[PDB]
Amino acid sequence: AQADIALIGLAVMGQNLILNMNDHGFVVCAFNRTVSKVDDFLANEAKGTKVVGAQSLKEMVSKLKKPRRIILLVKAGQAVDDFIEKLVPLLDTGDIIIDGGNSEYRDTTRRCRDLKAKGILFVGSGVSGGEEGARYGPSLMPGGNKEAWPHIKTIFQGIAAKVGTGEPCCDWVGDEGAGHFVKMVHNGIEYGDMQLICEAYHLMKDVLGMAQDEMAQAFEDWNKTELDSFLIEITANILKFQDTDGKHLLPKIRDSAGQKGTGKWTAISALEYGVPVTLIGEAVFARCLSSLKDERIQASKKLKGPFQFDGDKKSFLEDIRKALYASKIISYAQGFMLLRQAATEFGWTLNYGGIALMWRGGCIIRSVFLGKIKDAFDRNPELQNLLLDDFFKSAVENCQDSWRRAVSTGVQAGIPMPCFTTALSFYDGYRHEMLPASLIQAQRDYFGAHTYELLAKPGQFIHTNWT
């Protein structure tokens, strides 16, 4: 037994993770169901390294130091269960299987429980960063059976992306499917951040009449303060990019972002668990709307909008920045509410601060803002809503006049802002002690005798004879 860890699945992600582990001084045993791929890898991408191969699962297992650690990086679904089924008879009590694929969190929960009962420790880990990230520094989001954590922490944190202060973008997320649940929410959050940037762009372009390079410079400027983030960095770069003919490329690109994307699962989860994750929902629906390109061409010939901007451009541009920032705060508050609800549903203990850190590093959504979320949970690990943290409370308070102006102006101009508006609507709802939902309760009691509760006596159900 000379190998520190094994990885099954030699597509590019797996190869790159193996090479990353190798760089960090670990001896990795590579395996693939089509075994010829092992030799190919050893002869090529892994030539000259400490990587060793195996020609069967039994051989692979035999090469591993106990407790044995085996990473699965294969196609999500049946391929994962099939490898688990083949591995179990070969392993000893206390050995560890880590699924790093894009698996559905309920499958991860099932596997964790079933393997625990058989004496096998199971980890389901989110992996973010794509192929480059895998190779040099992914974000890793491990959850499952925490008995495994002390045995995988050194390798996982070693290979993970680090932030500038040195902390690894990898820590124990929580129980069972929590790691994969967190990856799912991350995917939805990404949709939100992208849509928010798009709305800011649309306001710059169509309310302020800004030039492409001017908008690039605005995003570059924005990237120097609170909004500092990878998505804003690349947006600036995209905006100034010129095609071979000297014309800007972005205006030539088809505005259809797809109807079937994975972000939908975050919004579906929110609806399943009854959490008001409104911004990610609008971001998903905005991609769907964009996909109706021919329908929008037709509608644009038949349906009319309202306007001419008269004001200080620099000021309104700043209003857009602050609207974006406040809306982003609401989106993440909502995402963390969903995490909190899953914790409640399944009895999971979630590393909220660590999750914020894990979403930096290799993740597309990486930002300084995420460090502020970590700070909030470090200040109060019992924090119940991001909006209650003094930093975020202050930020929203300082942004809200600008936010309202940006939204009011966009509305008068006919610019669609499904995410800015849902975020503001949510903020205004969340902060109200009294909402008109009592009218819904009265309506249902009126038409169906479904009963309502009095404010003074919650939990007691009353029917009134309204007629």
Adjacent-strand bridge partners of 123: 98, 144
Q: Tell me: is residue 32 an annotated ligand-binding position.
A: yes
CATH of domain 1-180: 3.40.50.720
Could you give the C-alpha distances from 233 to 28, 160, 459, in angstroms and in order? 36, 22, 51
Q: Tell me: is residue 379 an annotated ligand-binding position.
A: no
Which residue has tokens 């049946």?
78
Sign for the pseudo-dihedral over CA of 104, 183, 179, 272: negative
Neighbours of 166 (CB within 10 A): 6
How far is Cα 195 from Cα 289, in angstroms, rounded to an integer? 12
Q: Tell me: is residue 182 an annotated ligand-binding position.
A: no
Q: Tell me: is residue 113 an annotated ligand-binding position.
A: no
Secondary structure, 3-state, the chain: CCECEEEECCCHHHHHHHHHHHHCCCCEEEECCCCHHHHHHHHCCCCCCCCEECCCHHHHHHCECCCCEEEECCCCCHHHHHHHHHHHHHCCCCCEEEECCCCCHHHHHHHHHHHHHCCCEEEEEEEECHHHHHHHCCEEEEEECHHHHHHHHHHHHHHCCECCCCCECECCCCECCHHHHHHHHHHHHHHHHHHHHHHHHHHHHHCCCCCHHHHHHHHHHHCCCCCCEHHHHHHHHHHHCECCCCCECHHHCCCCCCCCCCCHHHHHHHHHHCCCCHHHHHHHHHHHHHHCHHHHHHHHCCCCCCCCCCCCHHHHHHHHHHHHHHHHHHHHHHHHHHHHHHHHHHCCCCCHHHHHHHCCCCCCCCEHHHHHHHHHHHHCCCCCCHHHCHHHHHHHHHHHHHHHHHHHHHHHHCCCCHHHHHHHHHHHHHCCCCCCHHHHHHHHHHHHCCCEEECCEEEEEECCCCC
How far is Cα 57 from Cα 425, in angstroms, rounded to an integer? 55
Q: Of the candidates 20, 79, 77, which has an alpha carbon nearest to the alpha carbon of residue 51?
A: 20
Sign for the pseudo-dihedral over CA of 206, 215, 133, 174: negative
Active-site positions read 183, 190
Sheet holding 52-53, edge to edge: 52-53, 28-31, 5-8, 69-72, 96-99, 121-128, 139-144
Q: What residue ranges of the chain are covered by domains with CATH 3.40.50.720?
A: 1-180
Compute φ and ψ for 121, nearest 5 degrees. -95, 125
Q: Tell me: is residue 141 an annotated ligand-binding position.
A: no
436 prior amide bond cis, ω within 30: no
Q: What residue ranges of the chain are covered by domains with CATH 1.10.1040.10?
A: 181-433
Q: Tell me: is residue 351 an annotated ligand-binding position.
A: no
CATH of domain 181-433: 1.10.1040.10
Q: Tell me: is residue 444 an annotated ligand-binding position.
A: yes
Q: Tell me: is residue 202 an annotated ligand-binding position.
A: no
Q: Tell me: is residue 305 an annotated ligand-binding position.
A: no
Angle, CA of 303, 306 and 308, to the nearest 5°: 140
Position 290, amino acid: S
Angle, CA of 409, 414 and 420, to the nearest 5°: 60
Q: Which two tokens stand for residue 24?
A: 């960090």
Q: Tell me: is residue 74 an annotated ligand-binding position.
A: yes
Q: Tell me: is residue 224 an annotated ligand-binding position.
A: no
Adjacent-strand bridge partners of 52: 29
Asked if 326 and 385 count as a contact pair (C-beta separation under 8 A), the reply is no
Asked if 451 and 462 count as a contact pair (C-beta separation under 8 A), the reply is yes
Q: Tell me: is residue 68 an annotated ligand-binding position.
A: no
How far is Cα 204 from Cα 313, in angstroms, rounded to an integer? 10
How far is Cα 88 from Cα 430, in angstroms, rounded to an integer? 49
Method underlying the structure? X-ray
Compute φ and ψ for 137, nearest 5 degrees. 170, 85
How far is Cα 134 from Cα 142, in angstroms, rounded to an integer? 15
Q: Of the candidates 50, 246, 21, 259, which has an alpha carbon nearest to the alpha carbon of residue 152?
A: 21
Q: Tell me: is residue 287 an annotated ligand-binding position.
A: yes
Asked if 204 and 344 count as a contact pair (C-beta separation under 8 A), the reply is no
Q: Which residues of 75-93 are buried (b: 16+ CB within 10 A; e: fewer)?
A: eeeeebeebbeebeebbee
Adjacent-strand bridge partners of 139: 128
